[PDB]
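Continuing from yesterday's entry. The apo prediction looked reasonable, so today I'm repeating it with 1FM included to see how the binding region is handled. Same sequence as before; SMILES copied from the compound registry.
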Amino acid sequence: GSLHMIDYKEIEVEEVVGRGAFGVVCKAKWRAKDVAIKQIESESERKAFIVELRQLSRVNHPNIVKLYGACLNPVCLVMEYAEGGSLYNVLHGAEPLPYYTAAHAMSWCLQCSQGVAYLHSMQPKALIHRDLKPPNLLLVAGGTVLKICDFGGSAAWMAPEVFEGSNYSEKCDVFSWGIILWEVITRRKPFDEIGGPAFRIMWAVHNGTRPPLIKNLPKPIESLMTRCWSKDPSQRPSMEEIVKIMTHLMRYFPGADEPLQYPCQHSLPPGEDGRVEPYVDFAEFYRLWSVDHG
Ligand SMILES: */C1=C/C(=O)[C@@H](O)[C@@H](O)C/C=C/c2cc(OC)cc(O)c2C(=O)O[C@@H](C)C1
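Holo prediction written out below.
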């Protein structure tokens, strides 16, 4: 895999757009176009920036944030600017929050599984993301196109074998994906009710706690979600299987290409009796499903 060699002088560093695992993300201008720059803040980040460089140099997929190139003085990654910001901000950010549909929710998850299945298909060795969560998922094309960034606060999406220090596989990303599917359908932060620190989430998840069940969730979606959540990573489906299932389910989710443009004030969490109400509405799914089946 190859990457551009860029002069920091060619970059017009604009405002800070966020902060990740290491470094800082700024909006910037490079070769008349808009970019996202992840600059180095401390000498300790060098090993991570280099590993991210060699990894992202071989990665080319529509659902993965494109790394245009890099600077080596100072060390900085020049990427495509995801104008729609993070999925976390769309779901849980500052008001006004956008309205979104069951079709957007399923589409975002399909697209995330498409990018992760590409990473897992990597030869000679599969690439594991290890930090799949809404802050690391970015949106473009009016909030309709999802792109994964920052390959590995995260305890709520972490597979129990990972924090157990156990030998884990690409099945840890499948667990995180299952949590994200619950999170987009409910528009709730997973394990928000469990007060911090992280060890309290880890203890609960390690003991079998999973997000509450969704009232009126279609049985095929419920089965997929809970299989992804399995304690035993060998019982979880592969990403290739999630892609196929999610692809087939989209026939009952039209409208995923509709940009996010509507204001939303639905933004009120009802209650918790072991079961939560979905934020999205499955009425149209059930209707479209009946036409095909009976
Ligand atoms: C991808 C994820 C990441 O580090 C997160 O911490 C993220 O939430 C920070 C924000 C990144 C960001 C934000 C915008 O618009 C607000 C646009 C972008 O292109 C990016 C971006 O590319 O972030 C990645 C470098 C990291």
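Comparison notes:
- Residues 17-20, 25, 36, 38, 65, 79, 81-82, 85-86, 135-136, 138, 149-150 surround 1FM (CB under 6 Å).
- The chain has two domains: 1-83, 84-294.
Will overlay with the apo model tomorrow.
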